[PDB]
């Protein structure tokens, strides 16, 4: 449980 996940750029 945290915030919106966008990923560490590939």
Secondary structure of 1-10 as H, E, C letters: CCCCCCCCCC
Cα 3 from Cα 6, distance rounded (Å): 9
C-alpha to C-alpha distance for 7 and 10, rounded to whole angstroms: 7
Distance of CA 4 to the CA centre of its chain: 6
């Amino acid at each position: 449980l945290g915030a919106s996940w966008h990923r560490p750029d590939k």
